[PDB]
Amino acid sequence: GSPELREKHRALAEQVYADGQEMLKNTSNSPELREKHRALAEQVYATGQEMLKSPELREKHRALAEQVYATGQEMLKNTSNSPELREKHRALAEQVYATGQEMLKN
Numbered sequence: 001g002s003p004e005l006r007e008k009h010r011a012l013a014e015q016v017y018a019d020g021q022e023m024l025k026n027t028s029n030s031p032e033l034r035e036k037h038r039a040l041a042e043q044v045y046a047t048g049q050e051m052l053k054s055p056e057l058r059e060k061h062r063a064l065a066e067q068v069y070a071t072g073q074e075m076l077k078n079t080s081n082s083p084e085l086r087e088k089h090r091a092l093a094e095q096v097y098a099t100g101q102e103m104l105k106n
């Protein structure tokens with residue numbers, strides 16, 4: 001319905017992915033790297049929601065995104081996030097990327 005919105009969502013999601021990768025390498029990350037990830041993620045969530053304003057694929061994406069976001073908020077309370085936590089995060093995050101891309105096919 002909005003191509004510009006779709007692409008904005010896309011570009012932001014790519015930046016979320018790049019930062020998370022960077023962070024995945026490092027054993028502790030500056031509060032500045034962490035916060036860019038988080039603020040980027042908030043804009044992905046917001047643009048996606050704006051897009052709602054296959055239905056079953058959208059529903060699965062949205063549900064998945066929600067769980068990744070909530071997972072991430074737990075991680076914000078931690079100075080240090082174990083690779084155990086970081087694994088559940090990446091796993092789930094991969095599913096969000098996949099389903100959103102599966103939508104591109106159309």
Ligand code: MH0
Binds near residue numbers: 007010058062068103
């Ligand atoms: C429920 C609203 C919603 C939320 C929340 C949401 C959250 C997220 N998304 Fe994402 N996403 C939403 C709705 C969409 C739609 C509707 C589409 C397909 C747009 C279209 O016009 O076909 C989409 N997302 C598409 C995508 C695509 C593919 C875009 C492309 O290559 O053109 C990616 C990578 C993506 N998402 C990632 C993410 C990530 C990461 C999050 C984590 C916050």
Ligand code: MH0
Binds near residue numbers: 023029089
């Ligand atoms: C596998 C790479 C990777 C990807 C992709 C990724 C994608 C996403 N993320 Fe997110 N994320 C990744 C790796 C991390 C790490 C490693 C950390 C913890 C940083 C640290 O130093 O403890 C993290 N993400 C941390 C977070 C945090 C908390 C920020 C903080 O602790 O300061 C949030 C809110 C978050 N994520 C959300 C999201 C969302 C939403 C997506 C989109 C699905």
